[PDB]
Amino acid sequence: HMAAQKTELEQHEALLHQARQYRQQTKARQQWLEEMQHDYSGFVQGVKEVLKARDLLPGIHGAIVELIRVPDRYETAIETALGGAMQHIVVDSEQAARQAIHYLKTNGYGRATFLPLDVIKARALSERERAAIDRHPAFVGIASELVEYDRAYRAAIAHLLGHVIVTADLKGANELAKLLHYRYRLVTLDGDVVSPGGAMTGGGAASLLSRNRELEMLSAKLQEMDETIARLERAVAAKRHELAE
Amino acid sequence: HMAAQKTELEQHEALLHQARQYRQQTKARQQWLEEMQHDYSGFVQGVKEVLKARDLLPGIHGAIVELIRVPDRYETAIETALGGAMQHIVVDSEQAARQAIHYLKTNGYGRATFLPLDVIKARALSERERAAIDRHPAFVGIASELVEYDRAYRAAIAHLLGHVIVTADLKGANELAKLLHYRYRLVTLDGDVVSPGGAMTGGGAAKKTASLLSRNRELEMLSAKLQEMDETIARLERAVAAKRHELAEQEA
Numbered sequence: 001h002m003a004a005q006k007t008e009l010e011q012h013e014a015l016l017h018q019a020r021q022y023r024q025q026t027k028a029r030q031q032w033l034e035e036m037q038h039d040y041s042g043f044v045q046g047v048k049e050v051l052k053a054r055d056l057l058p059g060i061h062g063a064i065v066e067l068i069r070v071p072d073r074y075e076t077a078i079e080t081a082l083g084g085a086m087q088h089i090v091v092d093s094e095q096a097a098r099q100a101i102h103y104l105k106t107n108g109y110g111r112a113t114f115l116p117l118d119v120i121k122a123r124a125l126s127e128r129e130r131a132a133i134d135r136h137p138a139f140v141g142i143a144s145e146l147v148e149y150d151r152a153y154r155a156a157i158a159h160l161l162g163h164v165i166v167t168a169d170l171k172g173a174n175e176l177a178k179l180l181h182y183r184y185r186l187v188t189l190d191g192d193v194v195s196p197g198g199a200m201t202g203g204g205a206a207s208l209l210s211r212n213r214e215l216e217m218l219s220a221k222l223q224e225m226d227e228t229i230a231r232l233e234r235a236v237a238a239k240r241h242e243l244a245e
Numbered sequence: 246h247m248a249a250q251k252t253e254l255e256q257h258e259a260l261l262h263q264a265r266q267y268r269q270q271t272k273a274r275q276q277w278l279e280e281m282q283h284d285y286s287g288f289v290q291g292v293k294e295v296l297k298a299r300d301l302l303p304g305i306h307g308a309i310v311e312l313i314r315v316p317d318r319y320e321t322a323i324e325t326a327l328g329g330a331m332q333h334i335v336v337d338s339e340q341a342a343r344q345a346i347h348y349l350k351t352n353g354y355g356r357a358t359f360l361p362l363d364v365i366k367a368r369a370l371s372e373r374e375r376a377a378i379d380r381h382p383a384f385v386g387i388a389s390e391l392v393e394y395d396r397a398y399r400a401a402i403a404h405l406l407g408h409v410i411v412t413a414d415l416k417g418a419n420e421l422a423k424l425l426h427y428r429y430r431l432v433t434l435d436g437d438v439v440s441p442g443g444a445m446t447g448g449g450a451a452k453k454t455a456s457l458l459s460r461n462r463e464l465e466m467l468s469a470k471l472q473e474m475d476e477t478i479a480r481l482e483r484a485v486a487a488k489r490h491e492l493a494e495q496e497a
Contacts, residue, residue: 046448097445104448111448170346174339182366192346197366197404199333200342203291203349203356 002243009239016232023225030218033211042208046110047087050100057103059096061117061153063087065208068147068157069216073189074140074166075209080191081143081164086208088113090156115156122158125165125184132179133165138172140189141165170194170202247495254488261481268474275467278460287457291355292332295345302345304337306362306398310457313402314393317462318434319385319411324458325436326388326409331457333358335401360401367403370429377424378410383417385434386410415439 040048047063054060061067065086070078079086089112091097097114104110125133125142133139140146143164149157165186167173173186173194186194192202285293292308299305306312310331315323324331334357336342342359349355370387378384385391388406410431412418418431418439431439 094445101447108449111446111451113446116445170343174343178364182364197368198339198364199358199360199404200339200346201356201358202346203354205350205353205355 005239005243009236009243012232012235012239016229016236019225019229019232023222023229026218026222026225030215030222033215033218037211037215044087044110044112046104046112047089049104049107049109050089050112053100053103057096057100059092060100061090061092063089064115064156064160066212067153068149068209069212070147070209072210072213074146075207075213076191077140077166077187077189078143078147078161079207079209080193081161081166081185081187084113085160088115088160090115090117090153092116093118115159117153117156120156120159122155123163124158125163125180129180133176136172136176136179138167138169138175139165140168143187170200174200247492250488250492250495254485254492257481257485257488261478261485264474264478264481268471268478271467271470271474275464275471278464278467281460282464287455287460288332289355289357291349291357292334294349294352294354295334295357298348302341302348304341305345306335306337308332308334308457309360309401309405310461312394312398315458315462316391316393317465319391320458320462321436322385322411322432322434323388323392323406324456325438326406326411326430326432327458329455330358330405332455333360333405335360335362335398337361338363360404362397362401365401365404367400368407369403370408370425374425374428378421381417381421381424383413383421384410385413388432 036042040051043051043063050057050060051063063086064082067090068078089100091100091114094116097116100112100114104112130142143161143166144157146166147157147161163184165173165176165180165184167176167186167188169190170188170192173188173192177184177186177194177198182194182198183196185196188202190202191204192200194200281287285296288296288308295302295305296308299307308331309327312335313323334345336345336359339361342361345357345359349357375387388409388411389403391411392402392406394402408429410418410421410425410429412421412431412433414435415433415437418433418437422429422431422439427441430441
């Protein structure tokens with residue numbers, strides 16, 4: 001009778017307490033990451049100073065890393081493909097780049113590389129090159145097709161990554177490089193590189209790219225917890241109502 | 246006038262003493278630098294570890310800086326042209342590069358770039374591009390044509406430097422850039438750079454350093470200096486004894 005209903009009401013009130021305190025700690029983690037994101041922690045000095053001057057300098061969009069989202073599986077490949085370009089700054093125009101350069105020079109604030117969005121042009125494999133590789137067993141993907149980004153930046157991201165192939169292993173990068181006459185850069189899932197011409201880079205032993213991925217994850221989980229909480233408050237209100245009368 | 250001879254004798258004795266001390270400090274600097282070389286000091290960890298294993302791993306020739314010799318007047322330009330590529334390791338083949346990369350990975354020994362001789366692609370301007378600049382007063386050379394190396398590494402050296410133009414000065418570099426439709430990187434003898442798209446990078450003064458080529462240059466300078474100091478010293482020793490002797494024959 002009332003013994004089972006009081007037990008169930010207690011499971012729900014306790015689970016409601018768990019979820020609220022858990023949500024509070026999850027929000028605290030989101031805020032820590034948001035602060036790190038918007039303080040530009042981990043960025044090179046000149047890049048940090050330009051982004052801190054978004055409210056003074058004209059035409060500053062953001063660093064490349066801020067503009068793309070990459071799954072965890074492909075993060076090492078994309079970071080390796082980009083190299084220093086992770087922190088290249090997308091700006092409206094070459095004029096905007098020159099103003100930011102002057103701002104850095106005058107203040108002694110370091111150095112940065114700029115990508116003028118009105119002028120930068122996409123790269124892409126030809127249709128025959130793509131067909132030459134995209135069913136090879138080591139092929140993972142064209143680097144630009146492995147990331148997400150707003151359409152406004154499509155020519156900038158194609159420029160940096162539309163001619164970069166991601167392969168599953170280094171032998172596969174060698175194989176596909178040959179099929180492509182060593183015209184293009186290939187990167188493996190583990191971060192080894194076959195550069196145009198056949199040079200090979202590798203070895204081994206926290207990425208800026210994991211920050212907006214964890215932030216997006218925390219965001220979705222927070223929405224999930226708010227509905228878990230709403231559901232648990234309904235269950236508490238429910239088992240109270242039948243029980244109250 | 247015996248006094249003028251005694252003073253000339255004291256001069257030569259003073260020069261001989263100072264030259265001996267100077268030679269000795271120069272010898273010590275030479276030995277110290279040769280020890281750094283033997284330690285692979287200044288190489289990044291991954292390159293150091295491959296070179297230490299160069300007789301265990303197959304097909305390891307060596308780092309670019311070990312395989313080229315650069316005339317003193319071109320050292321600054323070539324070191325600037327190469328940058329970190331003076332530590333790229335020439336190897337027999339892709340398989341050899343893969344085994345070396347596997348060695349670095351499994352031991353946590355860092356990263357390195359490898360140049361596999363069997364495939365590595367040479368680079369060169371077109372005939373018409375070379376003709377447009379070849380006779381310009383500020384043209385010094387194609388970087389790969391200013392450095393010495395054994396013929397076996399020709400494609401590896403051209404890959405790194407066949408598309409880099411060395412110029413007399415920056416005004417000449419900018420003239421040559423326009424003649425080449427801004428397609429190539431130019432380096433002056435003083436180390437200034439004109440690169441395609443270079444107006445999009447800048448800010449404060451860059452000042453990085455990984456100057457393994459400059460250690461080789463200093464070692465060649467010390468070798469040549471030490472030979473000169475040896476001859477100076479032996480000359481001064483003979484002049485001191487000759488003047489001391491001629492001074493004693495005249496107090497008769």
